[PDB]
Amino acid sequence: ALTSRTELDIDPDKLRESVVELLERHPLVFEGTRQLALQHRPEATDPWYEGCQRQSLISSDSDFTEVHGELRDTYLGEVFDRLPFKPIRTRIMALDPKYCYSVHRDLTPRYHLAVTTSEHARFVFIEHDKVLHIPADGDLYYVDTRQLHSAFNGGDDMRIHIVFGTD
Amino acid sequence: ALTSRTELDIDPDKLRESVVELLERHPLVFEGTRQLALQHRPEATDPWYEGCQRQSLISSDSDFTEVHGELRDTYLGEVFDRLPFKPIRTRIMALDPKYCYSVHRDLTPRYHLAVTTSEHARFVFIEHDKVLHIPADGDLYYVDTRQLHSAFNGGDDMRIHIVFGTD
Amino acid sequence: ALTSRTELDIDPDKLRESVVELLERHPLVFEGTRQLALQHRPEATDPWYEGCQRQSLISSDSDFTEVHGELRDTYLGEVFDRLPFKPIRTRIMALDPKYCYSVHRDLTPRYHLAVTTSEHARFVFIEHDKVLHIPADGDLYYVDTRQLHSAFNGGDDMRIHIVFGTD
Amino acid sequence: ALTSRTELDIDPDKLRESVVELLERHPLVFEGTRQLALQHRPEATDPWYEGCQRQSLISSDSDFTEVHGELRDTYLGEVFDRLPFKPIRTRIMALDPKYCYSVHRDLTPRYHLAVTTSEHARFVFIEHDKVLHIPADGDLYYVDTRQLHSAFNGGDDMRIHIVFGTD
Numbered sequence: 311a312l313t314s315r316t317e318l319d320i321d322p323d324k325l326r327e328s329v330v331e332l333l334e335r336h337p338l339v340f341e342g343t344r345q346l347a348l349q350h351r352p353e354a355t356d357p358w359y360e361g362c363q364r365q366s367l368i369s370s371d372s373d374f375t376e377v378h379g380e381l382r383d384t385y386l387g388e389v390f391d392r393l394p395f396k397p398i399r400t401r402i403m404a405l406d407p408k409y410c411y412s413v414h415r416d417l418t419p420r421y422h423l424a425v426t427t428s429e430h431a432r433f434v435f436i437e438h439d440k441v442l443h444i445p446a447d448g449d450l451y452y453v454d455t456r457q458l459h460s461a462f463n464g465g466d467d468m469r470i471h472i473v474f475g476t477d
Numbered sequence: 478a479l480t481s482r483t484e485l486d487i488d489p490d491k492l493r494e495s496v497v498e499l500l501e502r503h504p505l506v507f508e509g510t511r512q513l514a515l516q517h518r519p520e521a522t523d524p525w526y527e528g529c530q531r532q533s534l535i536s537s538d539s540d541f542t543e544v545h546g547e548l549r550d551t552y553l554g555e556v557f558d559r560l561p562f563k564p565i566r567t568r569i570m571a572l573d574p575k576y577c578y579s580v581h582r583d584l585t586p587r588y589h590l591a592v593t594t595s596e597h598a599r600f601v602f603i604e605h606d607k608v609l610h611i612p613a614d615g616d617l618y619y620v621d622t623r624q625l626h627s628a629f630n631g632g633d634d635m636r637i638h639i640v641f642g643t644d
Numbered sequence: 645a646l647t648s649r650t651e652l653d654i655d656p657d658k659l660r661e662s663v664v665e666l667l668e669r670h671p672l673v674f675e676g677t678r679q680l681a682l683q684h685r686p687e688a689t690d691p692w693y694e695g696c697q698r699q700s701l702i703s704s705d706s707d708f709t710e711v712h713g714e715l716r717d718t719y720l721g722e723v724f725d726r727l728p729f730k731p732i733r734t735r736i737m738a739l740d741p742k743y744c745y746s747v748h749r750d751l752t753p754r755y756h757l758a759v760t761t762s763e764h765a766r767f768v769f770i771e772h773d774k775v776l777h778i779p780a781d782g783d784l785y786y787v788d789t790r791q792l793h794s795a796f797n798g799g800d801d802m803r804i805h806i807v808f809g810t811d
Numbered sequence: 812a813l814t815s816r817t818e819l820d821i822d823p824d825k826l827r828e829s830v831v832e833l834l835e836r837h838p839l840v841f842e843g844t845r846q847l848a849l850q851h852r853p854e855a856t857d858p859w860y861e862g863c864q865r866q867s868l869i870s871s872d873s874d875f876t877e878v879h880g881e882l883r884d885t886y887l888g889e890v891f892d893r894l895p896f897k898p899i900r901t902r903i904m905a906l907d908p909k910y911c912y913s914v915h916r917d918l919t920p921r922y923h924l925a926v927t928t929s930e931h932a933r934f935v936f937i938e939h940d941k942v943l944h945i946p947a948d949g950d951l952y953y954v955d956t957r958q959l960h961s962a963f964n965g966g967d968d969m970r971i972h973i974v975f976g977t978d
């Protein structure tokens with residue numbers, strides 16, 4: 311299936327406030343898809359950004375295993391507590407307003423927790439001819455981005471997701 | 478009808494060439510969706526751009542009936558001649574690379590002729606759950622943009638369309 | 645070693661309040677060592693007490709795997725989140741005032757988190773000739789109760805521990 | 812000295828027998844630590860129990876100098892005779908099964924003669940980190956209960972000692 315839902319019963323309003331407060335202390339980097347690493351490699355010197363990556367030469371997600379300690383008593387830490395799997399290279403992934411991806415396939419699927427979104431933010435699966443929206447409802451959505459797809463955000467606000475790798 | 482094609486026997490490469498020449502002496506305006514009016518109101522004093530103004534300034538597309546004189550002797554001239562309907566408020570509409578717009582409805586459907594495009598440029602119809610690609614094949618694609626839709630260009634070049642209105 | 649410490653940085657005061665409030669809704673059973681099960685077997689009909697056990701005929705801990713759902717947004721749930729292992733048959737184990745055990749050996753060691761205690765509550769290792777006190781400091785203490793031992797509580801208040809099995 | 816033994820050639824079984832007979836006509840009082848005074852103050856009107864009163868009522872153990880008359884012709888009589896010191900405030904002190912008392916200090920050290928006991932009955936010295944067992948072997952065990960200590964009986968029977976004070 312392109313998408314599947316895992317109920318976490320996270321409170322989206324408390325989740326949002328927690329993410330917003332974290333970003334004031336650790337701001338997103340890049341443009342287009344702005345990022346913040348939530349997991350770092352052991353003894354990381356740059357724990358908040360090393361995991362962030364855009365370039366075409368993809369790296370391996372295996373070493374990005376440690377959830378930042380300062381998440382431990384935030385509501386955002388509670389999201390990690392309820393996951394049904396061991397996440398890797400978890401990142402905040404925020405699509406800029408009026409921004410979209412090339413039509414392409416990723417090497418690995420990922421789980422998405424939408425923190426902030428709108429009706430203007432969608433995944434477009436080209437061969438499946440399916441348009442998909444991830445609601446900020448506190449639940450976890452597996453999205454098979456190995457399928458030929460793009461994503462776009464036609465809104466004026468950033469579309470903020472938390473994106474988890476697995477294994 | 479949601480979309481339809483009218484074979485119309487236009488040479489994509491001549492078109493692209495005439496479009497590119499026209500724009501060197503009449504540049505697109507705006508960011509995101511860049512525009513140029515190909516028709517004006519009778520007696521307009523800004524005929525190349527009045528028709529590009531935002532909707533809140535334009536009562537009716539029907540007022541822009543006059544194809545610029547200096548198109549008479551160009552390949553665009555015969556484009557206008559081949560049309561099976563009468564055109565109004567025709568514009569060049571270019572989507573910037575990595576750009577998309579909100580999910581919305583237009584007042585009237587539109588006829589699209591793609592000048593330059595790529596596999597990363599699509600229309601999305603939200604309630605119909607259809608993804609559409611308009612190829613630069615010299616034919617005329619009707620798009621019922623009254624339906625809830627967005628368009629996006631995930632490529633690195635602008636996606637240049639000529640967009641015709643009608644009754 | 646008889647004992648070893650794992651820092652959880654749990655706040656003992658918040659831990660205590662949380663345990664006290666839970667016990668008003670789900671009271672301890674038995675006398676001497678009063679108990680409450682914090683993990684139940686899948687689809688348990690008696691989730692709060694089935695795991696509690698005293699009789700000489702010990703049972704296996706393997707099926708008691710599910711932390712009660714209503715712990716999920718208590719501070720007590722945070723204790724389970726920070727554990728460095730998968731606990732089984734976790735119980736609140738409260739020694740009554742003026743109460744002590746026979747001198748004996750258990751089949752398996754356990755981890756102890758002291759919630760409420762005093763200087764009057766000790767483990768006595770008979771062959772090691774060691775007297776040991778588990779402080780209510782928010783950390784986790786492995787105690788090798790396979791060693792010949794007793795425990796006693798000479799205070800006037802209950803000595804409340806959370807006791808985790810492992811694997 | 813923390814503990815010492817004085818061989819004293821007393822028959823454990825006769826002792827147990829004389830103790831058990833004495834108690835059928837002079838029962839222990841209290842719960843937890845059950846007691847009977849073997850010595851009284853000269854002219855006491857409650858000679859079997861005045862010496863069992865709590866500390867806040869007893870100025871000095873030295874006042875209870877008189878071994879009850881009716882012990883003269885019993886095996887307990889010769890017990891008193893074998894003593895290498897002069898006894899005062901001698902009592903039978905029995906720990907209830909599964910009972911212990913607080914960790915504390917007594918005013919004066921004491922001489923213990925175990926009548927009935929088990930491997931589940933011990934003294935614990937907290938700062939010295941020693942566990943002591945007093946066997947019912949007919950010998951006299953000095954215990955410096957001025958040291959921070961508790962005692963406990965993890966068995967199913969009472970632990971009966973005879974406890975002698977001295978100067």
Ligand SMILES: N[C@H](C(=O)O)[C@@H](O)CNCC(=O)O
Nearest residue numbers: 343410411412414415416631
């Ligand atoms: N990791 C990127 C993303 O999910 O945002 C990648 O898969 C796609 N980048 C597409 C582009 O360069 O338009």
Ligand SMILES: N[C@H](C(=O)O)[C@@H](O)CNCC(=O)O
Nearest residue numbers: 677744745746748749750965
């Ligand atoms: N599970 C019991 C406990 O840890 O409390 C057991 O190991 C000992 N029971 C001793 C007794 O019956 O005194």
Ligand SMILES: [Fe+3]
Nearest residue numbers: 414415416455
């Ligand atoms: Fe991608």
Ligand SMILES: [Fe+3]
Nearest residue numbers: 439440606607
């Ligand atoms: Fe479809």
Ligand SMILES: [Fe+3]
Nearest residue numbers: 581582583622
């Ligand atoms: Fe539109």
Ligand SMILES: [Fe+3]
Nearest residue numbers: 388391722725
């Ligand atoms: Fe948590």
Ligand SMILES: [Fe+3]
Nearest residue numbers: 748749750789
């Ligand atoms: Fe035990």
Ligand SMILES: [Fe+3]
Nearest residue numbers: 773774940941
């Ligand atoms: Fe020792």
Ligand SMILES: [Fe+3]
Nearest residue numbers: 915916917956
């Ligand atoms: Fe004492």
